[PDB]
């Protein structure tokens, strides 16, 4: 069956 | 005014080629290198300001591959139509003799995303010192791509950017000289 892929996330680094 | 961030992914058969990249206003923020399974930032300084988990993208590509296989059958095995690229060669900045500069081969409005690009200096191929972007998305769902060649300008030398695509009848040669 056709799968929904994921909207993916960047995350901030300390500085 | 308006800004746009795109998470753009593709899977291509029979090549078994996947791509995962983020685009901001037409520039690549990063892509994931499928072989090395690693996040590659388009400007390497970006890697000190943010992180991205490569494994999530790999999971997405596996979903994309599976979806492509479903669609291929559902479309009754309808293959993509080749759209050949437009090719433009320009320089980073106004050329001056001996001042380091960059030749830029802009490859645009094409699909599927497979191209063979070779730089030629005075007829001979250039095998090292070159670099390239991944395929960048377009709103018409075609692709664009840039290839780069650092060089020292000299009225002597001539250059061609040679581009091969299944949509062309023969290699496309875009010429440049001082």
């Amino acid at each position: 069956k056709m799968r929904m892929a994921t909207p993916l996330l960047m995350q901030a680094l300390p500085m | 005014e308006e800004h746009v961030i795109i998470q753009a992914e593709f899977y291509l058969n029979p090549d078994q080629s996947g791509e995962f990249m983020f685009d901001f206003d037409g520039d690549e923020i990063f892509h994931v290198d499928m072989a090395k399974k690693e996040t590659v930032w388009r400007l390497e300084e970006f890697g000190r300001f943010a992180s991205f988990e490569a494994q999530g993208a790999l999971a997405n590509i596996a979903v994309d591959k599976a979806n492509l296989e479903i669609m291929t059958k559902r479309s009754n095995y309808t293959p993509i139509t080749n759209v050949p690229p437009e090719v433009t060669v320009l320089t980073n900045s106004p050329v001056e003799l001996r001042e380091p500069n960059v030749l830029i081969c802009f490859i645009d409005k094409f699909t599927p995303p497979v191209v063979n690009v070779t730089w030629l200096r005075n007829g001979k191929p250039v095998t090292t010192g070159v670099s390239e972007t991944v395929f960048l998305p377009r709103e018409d769902h075609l692709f664009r791509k840039f290839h780069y060649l650092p060089f020292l300008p000299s009225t002597e030398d001539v250059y061609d950017c040679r581009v091969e695509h299944w949509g062309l009848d023969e290699p496309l040669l875009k010429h440049w000289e001082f």
Partner: protein, 181 residues
């Protein structure tokens, strides 16, 4: 000559006036045909072609995933905007400006700048010349810089100074380069 088959998935986050208004457009494209999409202004999947119909129906029957998709303008678009902001939205690179006669035709070359919004103006003895001005338009270099050429058609006199002036968010005072010969 082997036939190819291509699948693309695109999540487009559209931001208007910072993060004041955000629209998510999720697009599925088979070969070159977009088949199904999620539009946050709409709130559910809609098929774009007959090919996408089973997908719209099936995915819309999944209530949790639909509700997560509706939250995505926040959890996803606004989040990623927040992370990338300082080095994308706020990126400022100063243009290099060069003026030279063309290989009667003066060229103002503006290169290596970011972002793309820019105003280039030609002056002759301190007065703006608005006529005979041709521009190559905006050129994206693929490395987070742009360049542009702005040409002026002239007939230069002996003691005339032509000045190319460049306004850009990276420079608090517009840049100027003078040419005379």
């Amino acid at each position: 000559t082997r036939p190819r088959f291509l699948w693309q998935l695109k999540f487009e986050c559209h931001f208007f006036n910072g993060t004041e208004r955000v629209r998510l457009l999720e697009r599925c494209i088979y070969n070159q045909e977009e088949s199904v999409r999620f539009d946050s202004d709409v709130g559910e999947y809609r098929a774009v072609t007959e090919l996408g119909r089973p997908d719209a129906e099936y995915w819309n029957s999944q209530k949790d995933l639909l509700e997560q998709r509706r939250a995505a303008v926040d959890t996803y678009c606004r989040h990623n905007y927040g992370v990338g902001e300082s080095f994308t939205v706020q990126r400022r690179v100063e243009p290099k400006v060069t003026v030279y006669p063309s290989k009667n035709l003066l060229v103002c070359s503006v290169s290596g700048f970011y972002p793309g919004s820019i105003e280039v103006r030609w002056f002759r003895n301190g007065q703006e010349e608005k006529a005979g001005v041709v521009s190559t338009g905006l050129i994206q270099n693929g490395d987070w810089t742009f360049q542009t050429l702005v040409m002026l058609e002239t007939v230069p006199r002996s003691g005339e100074v032509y000045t190319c002036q460049v306004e850009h968010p990276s420079v608090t005072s517009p840049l100027t380069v003078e040419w005379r010969a």
